[PDB]
Design a protein around this nucleic acid. Structure first.
Ligand SMILES: [Mg+2]
Ligand SMILES: [Mg+2]
Ligand SMILES: [Mg+2]
Ligand SMILES: [Mg+2]
Ligand SMILES: [Mg+2]
Ligand SMILES: [Mg+2]
Ligand SMILES: [Mg+2]
Ligand SMILES: [Mg+2]
Ligand SMILES: [Mg+2]
Ligand SMILES: [Mg+2]
Ligand SMILES: [Mg+2]
Ligand SMILES: [Mg+2]
Ligand SMILES: [Mg+2]
Ligand SMILES: [Mg+2]
Lengths: 136, 290, 197, 191, 171
RNA sequence: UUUGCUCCACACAAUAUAGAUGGAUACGAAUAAGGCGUCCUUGUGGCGUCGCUGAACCAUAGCAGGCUAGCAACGGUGCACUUGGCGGAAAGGCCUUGGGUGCUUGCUGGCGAAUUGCAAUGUCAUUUUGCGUGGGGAUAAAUCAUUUGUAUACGACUUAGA
RNA sequence: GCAGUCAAGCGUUCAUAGCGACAUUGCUUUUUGAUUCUUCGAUGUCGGCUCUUCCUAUCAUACCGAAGCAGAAUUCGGUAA
RNA sequence: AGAACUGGCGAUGCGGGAUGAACCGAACGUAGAGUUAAGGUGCCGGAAUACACGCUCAUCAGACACCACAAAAGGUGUUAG
């Protein structure tokens, strides 16, 4: 038989790692790690979302599971080209993290008539679901 | 400034307060540890102190200079008529300690034990355990389910017993009732033993045997209000002491500005509960025996 | 938001939990705390044992029965830490304190209720990895609490019953998830998804 | 200085299976099985190619990276203890009174009994931990051999036997009596 | 505070004996222009025979970082005063601008040597343009090829006092 | 001791409130790791997926929630019962069988609401007690005084007395 | 009064087993001074006797480390009230 | 114990230093609203369990001027030179 060691791998910080900016002027946009400055801060660039190239503390961002290929210290035009080629915007939008964020925004943007409508629709769907929970 | 000459403290600070005991029957604060391999047995017994006498016995101490020689010894005699089992109680263990869960009594209680539940027995309708006896005399319904509750729960089982005070020469007629722990077998075996022994008597030779070390738990003889000289054993003050000499001269320093709890003072002497250990049984005598 | 909030004290730092709880009780929330024997104090066990012996030597010199009372149970240790943070000698403080109950284990009123945690007092979120910490049940047993084993046995029985409950709850949850997954992709579900639900 | 990454390597021989969930390490070899809890030390393990295991620490200080090499040594001690085993030889040293060492059975608990140490009437008993076997070696005078898979158990049992024979109220530079561990090695040495 | 770098150019006051004095220039890290001019006069009084009353300031200009989004390695030479003496130190800081490098320098000096702003002199700060001229390990470890590291034990900050599940520190 | 005591139902009063105003919505353990799903050779297993907070989930429309008609399903829920269990840590609660009865906003109709006048908590909760009905249930002790001396300054204690 | 640091020397030989000069840093408030803040419309003033409690800078007793510790005896030190 | 200049207490409350004649802030008619000083914002207790870079683990930690003390000498503890 063979040795079994639980890998337990998680979300490295490196050049090309996509981060979601947690707070500040951007606050909710995606940027790409361009260079590592030290243990606590990195140089990022978010040119497709309008995030300027900047040095930022890693406590201000969340590392995402997405990674694409960048050379270290690449400039903004290069970051834009590699970002669009790797197509990480819709790769981000397909994840349930981004879906949860969009769902939260939609629920907050609902109106009073719309909340009434979701009540009525939820009652109808509940009737169907509880009817179906009597055959199994 | 320091005490000029050292002397040990007068009296023991662990037997405090020197107050009267709450009851005349001293409490058994601890029972022997159980192991569930020996048969079911009572861990204690009740009796009445009758008096003292002397014995002569040949000493067997290999190395003493009174080895194989007669010694006279003081002994005390405890009159122990056989005790009557009326009741069992179970105890569950809680994060706040042991808690009694229920008590199951025997069907018939004697007059001498039911005099214990009265302050004025001569003017009474004697209504005690009448509805409990009515709870009996079915098939088993109200008694067997409470015994089953004791089986299902109740990590500790104790048996309620009472003395046969009418068999003693005392003028009391009101029996003493106590809880005695059982230390053999499982919980079901303990409660089966108790049920089988309701309304039945247990003799002292079923519990104790010869050459056995036992403990005596009792309330000591009372002496009322006592001065410090005999209550604590302090030194008598010299003869030319104004305002009395059976006292403690200095009951504390200036600071702290309070009399201390450790200073000897006048108060009640005797009628304290005590547990004296390691008393060897020299004879388990039989009453039906010249 | 709730009438009574039940806090599982396991993994919580004593002082940070006590500060949060004192502020809640003064603001008017009823709080019950369970499993006080699993509370944590930062620092080594020997350090906290020495601290308790330092507390234990302080007593009224002329009469020990009126001195500071040294309570040994983990619930009462937490209660001492919390009464220090409440102005307990006023009527307001007394009312704020009687809005509180602290237990070892989870007793049967609260074993069927929802337990929450306080993240600003959680050990795994507050202490640096590597820092040593003390368990309150062990400290209480070393200083004289007599009921560590009976609480552990009762907790084991409770955990067995709770696992039996949770298996049934998980099976029912998977049936409900199957039912509304089959009842998805309908016109009502698509309308709800458009509206954000 | 906060070294950002340090790592050590554990080599796994052919008959050896290492299973590491969270930080509970189990090693299975020809001589048996061994287990160890390492939840106190805060490292990460990674299997490379079924014969190599890296153990690493990220953003560690001086004490943390010291503990990393300690955990590597502990794990490969477990591996070599389940392959080759461990064997500690102790010798009896006495001037006048011969030390009598035997194995007795109190409640079937396998004790080592030491009598006549410096001519005293006290009988010293040291218990035997499980997994430790004791043989009194022939063709070498006054030699006891403790063997096992756990080096910690074998060395602690040998240390207990050494510490039970300490001389009191005497100059120990002159009264050199005791039972002293003289060799530490493996059961399958020079394999 | 948040530092800005200024060039300050000053001179002695012109006399009839000597018109056109020699125009000394300094580079000062300071929070504002008032502090920048004060520090200019402090250092010029350490160097030449002049003071504020006998001199004047002909120019003060903020110097911006030329490439404020390029990661640089800076060597910093510092003079500072301990409780017992005066010492020279060489440190090196990986950062994106000179002003950020001197800010973390002042933070590091206060943290490690309890040295306050009044006790520190910045001798010079200079870009180390070539690697392997970087000589400190605490910055040299960030210059290896294809550097990547994780961030274990994420502590997620809650907005509510009560949470309804045990948190996770996965990342 | 002139019909007293207790319990149950509602009838009316008084009494207050440390502070209802949709729901305290139940695994355990780890955190340098887990949850859920699925598969197998059932393991410290393989594969997939989730987290990045409860900003959730459930509930939620109708005179403070009325009166009626129908369609579609045989569901959901309240109430008084009823069957079988389980729960002793402070169990006093949790689950389940069967029938009855009410409602249903799952869907479509008909009638009503005003005038509290442009807001006024606009009164809907639960705690204790008393007094009446009508329907069950059960028929004691303690103290003083006398007495004892295993007790005792006095109280208190411990005994006895149809 | 009690405790340190340095180490020229003593200790046959060897600074530091045990000591330790010339210096120098402290602690304590059980000495005695210095001061005069409190009490002169009064806080009973020496010592002993009695009794309680506290401190530790430990004389004995418990377990230990060191020696110019062979044994015996002793000396230095630690945890210890 | 005794001088010099100034500012204070005495003769003075108020906010702060827990507490206090003298320190810090600020001097006072009776009220309302706003902003602050000195000092603070885990809870007692009004106010960020704010943000940021480091340092420290103490079997006597440390925690804020006056101020309610600690030194010489040491330590491959750890940190930076
Ligand atoms: Mg004296
Ligand atoms: Mg003395
Ligand atoms: Mg006289
Ligand atoms: Mg005087
Ligand atoms: Mg005077
Ligand atoms: Mg006077
Ligand atoms: Mg007077
Ligand atoms: Mg006086
Ligand atoms: Mg007087
Ligand atoms: Mg000492
Ligand atoms: Mg005057
Ligand atoms: Mg003033
Ligand atoms: Mg506040
Ligand atoms: Mg150092």
């Amino acid at each position: 038989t063979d040795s079994i060691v639980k890998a337990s791998n998680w979300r490295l910080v490196e050049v090309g790692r996509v981060v979601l900016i947690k707070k500040g002027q951007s606050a909710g946009k995606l940027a790409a790690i361009v260079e590592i400055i030290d243990q606590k801060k990195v140089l990022i660039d978010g040119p497709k979302a309008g995030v300027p190239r900047q040095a930022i503390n890693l406590g201000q961002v969340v590392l995402t599971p997405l990674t694409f290929a960048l050379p270290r210290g690449a400039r903004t035009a290069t970051v834009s080209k590699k970002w669009a080629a790797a197509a990480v915007c819709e790769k981000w939008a397909a994840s349930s993290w981004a879906k949860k964020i969009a769902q939260r925004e939609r629920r907050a943007a609902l109106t009073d008539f719309e909340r009434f409508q979701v009540m009525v629709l939820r009652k109808q769907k509940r009737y169907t679901v509880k009817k179906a929970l009597a055959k199994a | 400034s320091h005490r000029k000459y050292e002397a040990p403290r007068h009296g023991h600070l662990g037997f405090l307060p020197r107050k009267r005991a709450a009851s005349i029957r001293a409490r058994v604060k601890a029972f022997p540890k159980d192991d569930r391999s020996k048969p079911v047995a009572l861990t204690s017994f009740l009796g009445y102190k009758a008096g003292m006498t002397t014995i002569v016995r040949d000493l067997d101490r290999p190395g003493s200079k009174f080895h194989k020689r007669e010694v006279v010894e003081a002994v005390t005699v405890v009159d122990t008529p056989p005790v009557v089992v009326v009741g069992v109680v179970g105890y569950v263990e809680t994060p706040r300690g042991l808690r009694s869960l229920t008590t199951v009594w025997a069907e018939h209680l004697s007059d001498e034990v039911k005099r214990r539940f009265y302050k004025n027995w001569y003017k009474s309708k004697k209504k005690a355990f009448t509805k409990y006896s009515a709870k009996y005399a079915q098939d088993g319904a109200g008694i067997e389910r409470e015994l089953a509750r004791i089986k299902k729960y109740a990590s500790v089982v104790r048996v309620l017993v009472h003395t046969q005070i009418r068999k003693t020469p005392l003028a009391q007629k009101k029996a003493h009732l106590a809880e005695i722990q059982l230390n053999g077998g499982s919980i079901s075996e303990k409660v089966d033993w108790a049920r089988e022994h309701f309304e039945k008597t247990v003799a002292v030779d079923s519990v104790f045997e010869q050459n056995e070390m036992i403990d005596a738990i009792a309330v000591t003889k009372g002496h009322g209000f006592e001065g410090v000289t005999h209550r604590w054993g302090t030194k008598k003050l010299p003869r030319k002491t104004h305002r009395g000499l059976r006292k403690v001269a200095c009951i504390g320093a200036w600071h702290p500005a309070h009399v201390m709890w450790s200073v000897a003072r006048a108060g009640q002497r005797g009628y304290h509960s005590r547990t004296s250990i390691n008393h060897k049984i020299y004879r388990v005598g039989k009453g039906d025996d010249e | 938001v709730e009438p009574v909030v039940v806090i599982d004290g396991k993994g919580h730092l004593v002082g940070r939990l006590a500060s949060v709880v004192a502020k809640q009780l003064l603001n008017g929330q009823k709080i019950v705390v369970v499993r006080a024997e699993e509370l944590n104090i930062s620092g080594e066990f020997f350090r906290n044992k020495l601290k308790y012996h330092d507390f234990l030597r302080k007593a009224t010199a002329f009469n020990k029965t009126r001195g500071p009372f040294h309570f040994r149970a983990p619930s009462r240790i937490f209660y001492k830490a919390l009464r220090g943070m409440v102005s307990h000698k006023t009527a307001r403080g007394k009312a704020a304190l009687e809005r509180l109950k602290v237990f070892e284990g989870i007793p049967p009123p609260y074993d069927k209720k929802k337990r929450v945690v306080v993240p600003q007092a959680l050990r795994v979120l507050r202490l640096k990895p590597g820092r040593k910490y003390t368990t309150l049940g062990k400290l209480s047993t070393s200083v004289g609490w007599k009921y560590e084993d009976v609480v552990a046995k009762l907790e084991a029985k409770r955990k067995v019953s709770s696992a039996e409950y949770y298996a049934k709850k998980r099976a029912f949850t998977k049936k409900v998830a199957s039912a509304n997954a089959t009842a998805a992709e309908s016109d009502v579900a698509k309308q709800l998804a458009a509206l954000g639900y | 200085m906060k070294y950002i990454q340090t790592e050590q390597q554990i080599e796994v021989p052919e008959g050896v299976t290492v299973s590491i969930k969270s930080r509970i390490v189990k090693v299975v070899g020809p001589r048996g099985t061994l287990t160890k809890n390492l939840k106190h030390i805060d490292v990460t393990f990674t299997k490379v190619n079924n014969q190599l295991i890296k153990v690493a620490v990220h953003n560690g200080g001086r004490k943390h990276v010291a503990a990393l090499r300690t955990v590597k040594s502990l794990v490969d001690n477990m591996i070599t203890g389940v392959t080759k085993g461990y064997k500690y030889k102790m010798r009896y040293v006495y001037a006048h009174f011969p030390i009598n060492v035997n194995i007795v059975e109190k409640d079937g608990a396998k004790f080592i009994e030491v009598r006549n140490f410096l001519g005293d009437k006290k009988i010293r008993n040291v218990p035997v931990r499980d997994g430790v076997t004791i043989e009194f070696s022939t063709n070498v005078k006054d030699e006891i051999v403790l063997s096992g898979n756990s080096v910690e158990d074998v060395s602690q049992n040998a240390a207990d036997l050494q510490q039970i024979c300490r001389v009191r109220n005497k100059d120990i530079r002159k009264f050199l009596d005791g039972i002293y561990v003289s060799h530490k090695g493996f059961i399958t040495e020079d394999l | 505070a948040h530092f800005k770098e200024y060039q300050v150019i000053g001179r002695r006051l012109p006399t009839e004996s000597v018109p056109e004095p020699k125009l000394f220039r300094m580079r000062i890290f300071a929070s504002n222009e008032v502090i920048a001019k004060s520090r200019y006069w402090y250092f010029l009084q350490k160097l030449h025979k002049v003071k504020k009353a006998s001199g004047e300031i002909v120019s003060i200009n903020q110097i911006n970082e030329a490439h404020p989004t390029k990661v640089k390695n800076f060597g910093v030479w510092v003079r500072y005063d301990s409780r017992s003496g005066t010492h020279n130190m060489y440190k090196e800081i990986r950062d994106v601008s000179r002003v950020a490098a001197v800010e973390t320098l002042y933070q590091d000096m206060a943290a490690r040597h309890r040295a306050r702003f009044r006790s520190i002199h910045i001798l010079k700060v200079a870009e180390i343009e070539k690697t392997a001229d970087v000589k400190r390990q605490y910055v040299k470890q960030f210059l290896t090829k294809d550097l990547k590291f994780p961030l274990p034990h994420r502590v997620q900050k809650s907005t509510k006092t009560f949470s309804y599940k045990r948190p996770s520190t996965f990342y």
